[PDB]
Design a protein around this ligand. Structure first.
Ligand SMILES: NC(=O)C1=CN([C@@H]2O[C@H](COP(=O)(O)OP(=O)(O)OC[C@H]3O[C@@H](n4cnc5c(N)ncnc54)[C@H](O)[C@@H]3O)[C@@H](O)[C@H]2O)C=CC1
Ligand SMILES: NC(=O)C1=CN([C@@H]2O[C@H](COP(=O)(O)OP(=O)(O)OC[C@H]3O[C@@H](n4cnc5c(N)ncnc54)[C@H](O)[C@@H]3O)[C@@H](O)[C@H]2O)C=CC1
Ligand SMILES: NC(=O)C1=CN([C@@H]2O[C@H](COP(=O)(O)OP(=O)(O)OC[C@H]3O[C@@H](n4cnc5c(N)ncnc54)[C@H](O)[C@@H]3O)[C@@H](O)[C@H]2O)C=CC1
Ligand SMILES: NC(=O)C1=CN([C@@H]2O[C@H](COP(=O)(O)OP(=O)(O)OC[C@H]3O[C@@H](n4cnc5c(N)ncnc54)[C@H](O)[C@@H]3O)[C@@H](O)[C@H]2O)C=CC1
Ligand SMILES: O=C(O)C1(C(=O)O)CC1
Ligand SMILES: O=C(O)C1(C(=O)O)CC1
Ligand SMILES: O=C(O)C1(C(=O)O)CC1
Ligand SMILES: O=C(O)C1(C(=O)O)CC1
Ligand SMILES: [Mg+2]
Ligand SMILES: [Mg+2]
Ligand SMILES: [Mg+2]
Ligand SMILES: [Mg+2]
Ligand SMILES: [Mg+2]
Ligand SMILES: [Mg+2]
Ligand SMILES: [Mg+2]
Ligand SMILES: [Mg+2]
Lengths: 328, 328, 328, 328
């Protein structure tokens, strides 16, 4: 199938590599690669992270100076401002090149056309799915992790070879796997989660609390303990990742199984409709517009919602309680 | 407030205690109490668990023989068959008593009237919220855990004193806390979760998979990795339990925060309606009827759904994949 | 294709066979097989049918005694009570075996999990589609008939070989055919008919009668003669089975063809919706629950409907008329 | 209650005050305060208003120069551009301070997060409800007026003391009153009016005119005279402010009272729904976004609507008429 369990490391040996940033990924992937036998450099904004990077023994020039020396570059930085940074300080230099290769962690800014490098640059993606600390939590075990790979532009007939070369250049395969997928799929997926089941889950919990309290005379403490103040969800998620989502429920009671299955097959259509709506909203590029404008206005809605959420009853009760249990 | 952080241990010292069962709770609570300085006994069906109980040094008679010797009894056994067991082998003996006390882990069978002991028995509840192994995972740390307490019938003016006595008799407070609550609240809560956000979550995930695959040319492996085959959810749940549900999201990107909050406040009404419907269905006693009948018929629906779920596309793909990653 | 026109008879020669029942199928299939050169026995409730079976020269022990002697067993008895009979008088004995094979006529009780034999028994189906008398009405002609075959559990790598062996052991192929199909498909099909076009047909006839009488001043006799008191439908059905459903209509008038076709293509969506609803109701296992409970209550609805139907106007008129025509 | 009828003047005596602007409020409040015995200064854009300010005897430096000298600052300028002005010319200087206090007239830019001063500055509000000329029209009478007060950030445990100090520093209490209220309430209120009853009123008048003319053959002049070209509304509003909204209607005829009351209680739900929608739209921060973007695009909609309104029939007729009556 489309999977790839291991591959070569030929094109990247002999070349210099440009790593932009020393955050979560940047540090991890960079240290890994240095330890994989390659000549690498770092580009960073001269601040605390720069202190830490030069600490760990990585020569760090300015961004553009690291792009002049390298024939490859990894832009391991945020998604909300990368546009301007690329426009001012990277595009000029890049125009001062002929054979180059650029790789990202996310496909947001490219899938939607906010960044359109020239045709003289092979354009690719390599994206994992962790938060970043799990990857050292796996590397010290000598394991490997899974990732997604994509190619946007090939001007060398070699983008895929560089793709798998990089893949092995970060310690994913062998030990994990590597999937090949467009920039578009990656963005679509990373967003669907952030728009569909996470917020639905949270709203459902909030509603259960509000209902139980204001309509059957229950104490906030008990509600919080049942719903999320207990680590039940965490163990469930672990068992899911280990055994399987359904096989997991065998460790539950028959009553729970019955209710859960019935209600699942009873509400599948509604959420399906919702997911359709949101995925369509995304595929078209509307959400990117919405978000970019909300940046350009001053983040008002962001502000007001962050306020409302924290000034809700549930949050205050959680505050009192977490205080009681010593939890910070 | 209604909370209780510590209390006495007076009524239970000098009396014998009857522990019915040696499963997860039974073993844990029983060993704890023995180690808390009390004279205890065990009643069990003579099978593997009986071997393990007599192994760990607990004299174990027959059930009814343990109820004749004890003035207290803890029925630490399932919720689906306990009815018959109480009718045949416990009610007679109990009628052969005057001052007795009975406590449960769950309020299902009592809140709905499937078990109505005489008026010569103080009736109570003590219910934690773990799965059971976390409690030793906390006891070896000398900590304490939270629980719920309830009283159904008082024929001694002392049910609450026995309640807190038991509470401390199992190593919850001091170290955790103890909430007081009817049998009804406990059942309502344990069920709302099993009917509202768990199945909704699962259906949403399933729908995201189905959509992404059958409508945007996406490979199954990537979908599974993004949604649940990765341990993302587990870390999120842990951070929730530690910091707070909302404060958790600070460790995410602004884009995720924005989308999540907007969509949460956008879909809150729908799930609210759903939760209303289900909670009402429960408060009335309809679900208990449904479930009892489904038992009396031969568990057909249970069977067919357990089949359909496992014969779905997502499950088969998860099978192939988990095999690849070595996960059992 | 999946069809099978003939096969072997090897595994069943040398073994003893257990036939449970001497009703329509039991007698027919048993006599056929005896005449096909096999050593067979019979198990039956000692009543009139037992008299008839021992009459026709089949040694008949008790049920369980016939299962102890046989390595195969055919449960040729009803679907509504077979559960208890299997639980009490068959499951014990079967537990007293290692290599066994069990076959049914219908898949109701198995497809829905009301009967779950051990894993040490190959489980199969062989189901024809007649009412039973047509099969002798074909055997004396040396023909063969069609059937469905299914396998639920294979503990021998041989369930299919036994399947076709049995198939030929009853005189179906060669002469007819044999289709392979799950238990589930068989039940689904046998029920869809009993829920979709039969009752719709009957209700349509009833409605035509009621309308014609109470709204255009027509005589009951004429209505009954036109609709069903005449053998028109029978000849139509015969021609359907012989030539084909559509090619049949050539023997009609052009007017009939035109009206029929137009109205058929005009009402196809409605009945489609209905059929969807009912098939879904079945696939899930709800109907089995409904029916089992209606048994457990005392067949009240059954009773009241059997009353209403017979106390309707159409039935009384049919009574008077059939009396006139000498029809019993 | 929350009201405050008079308070102290202690913290502001000995300190210098920074007044930004010399418009309606700026001039009024500044002259008042100077006349209340305080050392004050002015910051202004060097234009006509600057001429007038230096005319009236207020030393006026540049904006930032007035913020360097003052330990307090009052930003008495518009709400639509204040953002940039604060970003460029005020934030730097303010960063060059430790103990500072800032007060506004409106809470728009702060309630929605368009301006977030540091935590080393106590942030407050003092907002009246006039248009500004009424305040001298009251001061020469030695009266006092009502205002709203708010505190956004306290880094001194003294924000409220400065609040009431300022309050008395402008001649409101004693003589009027002072209410305490968040920035949020002030903005919400100032906007609800501008979105709910003003535009509804205007649309109702417009519709009455259009209807009367185009459907019962009436002359424009009469319609205009009845509806608003007469000063009826003004006298009604005055009586409202004086006596009370309802007690006002006693000076009317019984017929008017009856019709008005009935129709009021008959249409209360509709407008309630409308008001809910708009208030919700505001609380969330959507309107601020809308307005900021409409600025960033070039005020197109503003333009087109200002055109349509003036090119309507009613406006032209009003033009002809007001000309007739000599009204400019
Ligand atoms: N939890 C996470 O942060 C994960 C990030 N990703 C993706 O990788 C990218 C981020 O990777 P990380 O660096 O590990 O996360 P991060 O949030 O720590 O990235 C911050 C980095 O960007 C640099 N930076 C910040 N502001 C800058 C500015 N104004 N100008 C120039 N440089 C600036 C900083 O040097 C810093 O190293 C994102 O695009 C994301 O889609 C993928 C998986 C998880
Ligand atoms: N994950 C869990 O199992 C938790 C259980 N509870 C509640 O506690 C009760 C169950 O406690 P556990 O024993 O720890 O769970 P369990 O599922 O391990 O219960 C098995 C025990 O029940 C006894 N038993 C089982 N079948 C029996 C039968 N036919 N006849 C006589 N005795 C039989 C056995 O002695 C066995 O030890 C339930 O009511 C549940 O509501 C509360 C929190 C979590
Ligand atoms: N003729 C029909 O109505 C059709 C029957 N089938 C299927 O075959 C099976 C029945 O086969 P048949 O015997 O030919 O129909 P049947 O209605 O004549 O069944 C009566 C047989 O069941 C046995 N029996 C009845 N009550 C019993 C009891 N309380 N305890 C023990 N044994 C009892 C008797 O030995 C009797 O011979 C059904 O499951 C049906 O799904 C399939 C095609 C047509
Ligand atoms: N009738 C009104 O306009 C009232 C105003 N308010 C609130 O008070 C504030 C306005 O108060 P006023 O000064 O009396 O109204 P205003 O409209 O006369 O304010 C204009 C002032 O802002 C200065 N200014 C204008 N454009 C500038 C620019 N590009 N750069 C720097 N400075 C500029 C001018 O020097 C002028 O003094 C607003 O925030 C409003 O919410 C409250 C009650 C009524
Ligand atoms: O909600 C609960 O605590 C569970 C139960 O079976 O009672 C584990 C699912
Ligand atoms: O910000 C992202 O990209 C997250 C993801 O879905 O992987 C953490 C939320
Ligand atoms: O209904 C009838 O009798 C038919 C006719 O053509 O008249 C044969 C169909
Ligand atoms: O509309 C009018 O002129 C009023 C009347 O009573 O006629 C005063 C209200
Ligand atoms: Mg994301
Ligand atoms: Mg993600
Ligand atoms: Mg439960
Ligand atoms: Mg629970
Ligand atoms: Mg049938
Ligand atoms: Mg049939
Ligand atoms: Mg305003
Ligand atoms: Mg106003």
């Amino acid at each position: 199938d489309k999977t790839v369990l291991d591959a070569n490391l030929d094109p990247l040996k002999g070349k210099t590599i440009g790593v932009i940033g020393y955050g979560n990924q940047g540090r991890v992937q960079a240290t890994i690669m240095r330890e994989n036998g390659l000549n690498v450099i770092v580009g960073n904004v001269k601040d605390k992270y720069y202190e830490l990077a030069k600490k760990e023994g990585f020569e760090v020039y300015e961004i553009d100076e690291a792009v002049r020396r390298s024939d490859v570059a990894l832009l391991l930085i945020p998604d909300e401002v990368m546009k301007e940074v690329y426009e001012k300080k990277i595009a000029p230099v890049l125009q001062g090149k002929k054979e180059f290769v650029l790789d990202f962690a996310s496909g947001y800014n490219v899938a939607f056309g906010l960044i359109r490098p020239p045709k003289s640059v092979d354009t690719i993606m390599v994206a994992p799915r962790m938060v970043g600390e799990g990857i050292m939590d796996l590397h010290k075990q000598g394991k490997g992790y899974p990732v997604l790979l994509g190619v946007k532009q090939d001007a060398s007939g070699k983008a895929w070879d560089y793709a798998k070369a990089i893949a092995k250049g970060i310690g994913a395969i062998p030990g994990g796997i590597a999937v090949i997928s467009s920039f578009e799929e990656e963005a679509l997926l990373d967003l669907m989660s952030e728009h569909t089941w996470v917020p639905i889950l949270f709203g459902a919990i909030k509603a259960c609390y509000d209902i139980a309290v204001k309509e059957y005379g229950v104490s906030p403490e008990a509600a919080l303990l049942e719903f999320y103040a207990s680590g039940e969800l965490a163990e469930i998620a672990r068992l899911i990742a280990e055994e399987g989502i359904f096989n997991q429920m065998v460790h539950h009671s028959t009553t729970s199984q019955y209710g859960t299955l019935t209600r699942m097959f009873k509400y599948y259509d509604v959420v399906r409709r919702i997911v359709e709506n949101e995925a369509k909203y995304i595929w078209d590029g509307s959400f990117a517009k919405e978000w970019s404008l909300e940046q350009q206005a001053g983040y008002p809605v962001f502000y007001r919602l962050w306020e409302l959420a924290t000034q809700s009853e549930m949050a205050k009760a959680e505050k009192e309680l977490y205080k009681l249990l010593g939890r910070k």
